[PDB]
Swiss-Prot record, chains A, D:
Homotetramer. This is (S)-hydroxynitrile lyase. Acetone binds at T15, S84, C85. It catalyses: a monosubstituted aliphatic (S)-hydroxynitrile = an aldehyde + hydrogen cyanide; a disubstituted aliphatic (S)-hydroxynitrile = a ketone + hydrogen cyanide; an aromatic (S)-hydroxynitrile = an aromatic aldehyde + hydrogen cyanide; 2-hydroxy-2-methylpropanenitrile = acetone + hydrogen cyanide. The gene is HNL.
UniProtKB/Swiss-Prot annotation, chains B, C:
Acetone binds at T11, S80, C81. Its EC number is 4.1.2.47. It comes from Manihot esculenta (Cassava). Involved in cyanogenesis, the release of HCN from cyanogenic glycosides in injured tissues; the release of toxic HCN is believed to play a central role in the defense mechanism of plants against herbivores and microbial attack. Decomposes a variety of cyanohydrins (alpha-hydroxynitriles) into HCN and the corresponding aldehydes or ketones; two natural substrates are 2-hydroxy-2-methylpropanenitrile (acetone cyanohydrin) and 2-hydroxy-2-methylbutanenitrile (2-butanone cyanohydrin), but in vitro can also act on 2-hydroxy-2-methylpentanenitrile (2-pentanone cyanohydrin) and mandelonitrile. Residues 5-242 form the AB hydrolase-1 domain. The gene is HNL. It catalyses: a monosubstituted aliphatic (S)-hydroxynitrile = an aldehyde + hydrogen cyanide; a disubstituted aliphatic (S)-hydroxynitrile = a ketone + hydrogen cyanide; an aromatic (S)-hydroxynitrile = an aromatic aldehyde + hydrogen cyanide; 2-hydroxy-2-methylpropanenitrile = acetone + hydrogen cyanide. Changing C81A: No change in catalytic activity and substrate affinity. InterPro entries: AB_hydrolase_1 (IPR000073), AB_hydrolase_fold (IPR029058), MES/HNL (IPR045889). 2-hydroxy-2-methylpropanenitrile binds at T11, S80. This is (S)-hydroxynitrile lyase. The lineage of its organism: Eukaryota, Viridiplantae, Streptophyta, Embryophyta, Tracheophyta.
Length: 262, 258, 258, 262
């Protein structure tokens, strides 16, 4: 009757162990459409110079995004797209910058809520997927004496579970740039719950595929049932890295989020 | 058809990632492929200000080679400035090297100092366009110049013909780097027994927009390779724009030198 | 008389060498003594420009403590700025620490930021005489100030009463160092459960010519120790000028806290 | 009839694994006498920032001394005092700066000659003392493919053989600052012989004690017999570190060298 088409500023957030590089196919697809796209490496990820053992919480890990948001011009708002564990970065960020956020998009992602502890979807995730195959774990003691478990994701888990359907060039790349990462689960467990006026108020779009071999369908559906998103988009096929296996489809869904909220 | 163990070496500011298309292609032919991050490159944790020479920058390669089991030999493939990593490596581990392959690369010699081809490259291409430079003093007091490669330079000169996904990946993981030109200017020349003796295969395209055809042609005249393969078209990053063509030449190098 | 395991921690720019008289004295009483070089100090191979905070500088202590066998506790003895290494350590490993001993040292608290006693020290002693300063940008962009301690300052203020052999040794192995003042200014305060809970013994002399008696007295009033021992005379380096007096106080600390 | 007393500029050179710090008692004793004293750390020794694996020859190891000598004012000459393996640093230096050297003093030191290979007294030394007790060895490959053996001197060998009679404060200090070191024997073996006009022409004073428990009396006497020094001074007692156990005696001998040659 009236048709709307909106250009938007997406801030793309990788999951633990990965970096901005995972968005190297979706960032151009989005810019072809005329959007502005920022893909940030979080602390100790991608080519960020910090080492994970110098990071003490998922909040500290989130520093690049929060600094970025501190610096957005007055009146500018972004759509934050986070994959896998980056839903926690979107919740940390929305409790600090709710007015700079047009919508949070969870892409095969943790969907934190305000009712339970910050670590709650992490517990549920680990319950749904308790074997990380060839992943190696390590520990360090943080600034207040908490022991932090880090992981070096194994190559079979990478091949089969996270990058199932990706090309060999994309699977080799992941192996060439993957870093250690941590869920910081135990400090998230001690963390104040996400707020209703910050995080609880942002618009939330949930993109997922039932072919995801690490954030499995029963888990994903549990999260959707646990904290109803404003909108759900299920992509058929692909794998956990839909920004690699369904790049264009994800860019078309993201155009729709920009039209509704940006 | 011989299967070989190839060790792929990226150029300054880049990392093992630049080989993410060529490593699976080689492996489809049954080759073993090792792709290393040099010091302060790709996801190596060291920062460029702690590296004091091009030989210290080469450490991942020299450690690798130090540990290769007895009787094993590798073909080292080096792009752009990595021709200097092949020559440093060949002088220390000549018996472990079946051949060196220069992929749009510097081709050092034994007659001039180690910085000679770096001098000539800068003469052929003196404007790095939007590249930024920085300096630090190394542990011995020498001033080292680092660069952060400009994105117009990346787009138009290095990744000229690359896809947008590839160029974008380049911007996302590019690190600072250094020619260590002045320490190379002070370094002993590469030896005739080490580097001078290895087999040398030169791969290039005249469509390369940073290692320009007359510099490449001067290099070949200055120190004639055992073989020169020229790929038509593509750009400076032939392992991305002509991946199967370089995998095929590299099969010819495994056949010839094992 | 209790034998204890003492971990001795030097101040910025110095190294484990400053304890070369006190380590044998303690061992004559059957104590176990570990004396560590902090990052970029004594013969540690790292350079100060690669260290980005006082917590990274503390790494040798935190690794040590990370590996102490279960059920073992240590008395950490820290001189001058090493009071900050004790507080960082006590927050991460409170159960491994029988007591902290401040030897003419900064005595951080929990109520103000980690840089508060550094601010007050500089206020009490703002002229470092012939000390030189340098800066570098750390990995996060903060400007770090380093110093090379001047020899008149070493002779007259730090090693005032020391023998000529000792002062000369100091000049021969002194390294650059940093207060990382501004990163400490940004650091979370020391916790009441970690650092706030440990036993704290303060050793000093009013003849100290860099940590002057009114700053030391302000520290004790600002955060009253469990015990304060005052040694008459000597100088700032009591582990060199009053070695047996500090070994004797430290026997009293092993007796009291094990 | 006429009595002479001379003030001189001594350049003190430590042995491999040690640093300028070993001279911390003799440097003040000499300055009490009015001499000028330089004590240098050689490459990868004392607090020199270079690591031994970046050093490729005893010549490269000798860089601090040669740079120093390049910089001496015209007409200035020094007496170089070298302990244990530092006789090779004195020979490397005298072939480059013979006119800046008033005399070489070998203090329980290797006494290189011009007739045999540079590595020859190193072979003889290792033959006289073949067991380095708890010393650990390591290897790296140098800039031309030679394998270099390095050593971390063991603590018993330090206690009993090198620092036999030193105080506990001096023995603990050595342990606190000792570094890896290398004889570079195999590259010395390939090295051109020291020259007769450089090294063969400098005055050479040999200080030693027969109580030295690592450069043993039969070895020392072999060296004295092998290449007759211009003057020999035998200190009674002490140990291998005579600059620590006989500091004043060594300073009085060194006053005599300054009167004869400086």
């Amino acid at each position: 009757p009236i048709s709307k088409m909106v250009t938007a500023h997406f801030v793309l957030i990788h999951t633990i162990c990965h970096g901005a590089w995972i968005w190297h196919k979706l960032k151009p697809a989005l810019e072809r459409a005329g959007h502005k796209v920022t893909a940030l490496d979080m602390a100790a990820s991608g080519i960020d110079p910090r080492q994970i053992e110098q990071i003490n919480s998922f909040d500290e890990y989130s520093e690049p995004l929060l600094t970025f948001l501190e610096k957005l011009p007055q009146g500018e708002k972004v759509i934050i797209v986070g994959e896998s564990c980056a839903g926690l970065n979107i919740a940390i960020a929305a409790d600090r910058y709710v007015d700079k956020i047009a919508a949070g998009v969870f892409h095969n992602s943790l969907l934190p809520d305000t009712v339970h502890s910050p670590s709650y979807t992490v517990e549920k995730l680990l319950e749904s997927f308790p074997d990380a195959r060839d992943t190696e774990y390590f520990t360090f003691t943080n600034i207040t004496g908490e022991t932090i478990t880090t992981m070096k994701l194994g190559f079979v888990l990478l091949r089969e579970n996270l990058f199932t359907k990706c090309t060999d060039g994309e699977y080799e790349l992941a192996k060439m740039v993957m870093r250690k990462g941590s869920l910081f689960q135990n400090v998230l467990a001690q963390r104040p719950k996400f707020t209703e006026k910050g995080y609880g108020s942002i618009k939330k779009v949930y993109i997922w595929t039932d072919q995801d071999k690490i954030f499995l369908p029963d888990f994903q559906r549990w999260q959707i049932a646990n904290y109803k998103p404003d909108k759900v988009y299920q992509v058929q096929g692909g794998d956990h890295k839909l920004q690699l296996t369904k790049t264009e489809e994800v860019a078309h869904i993201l155009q729709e989020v920009a039209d509704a909220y940006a």
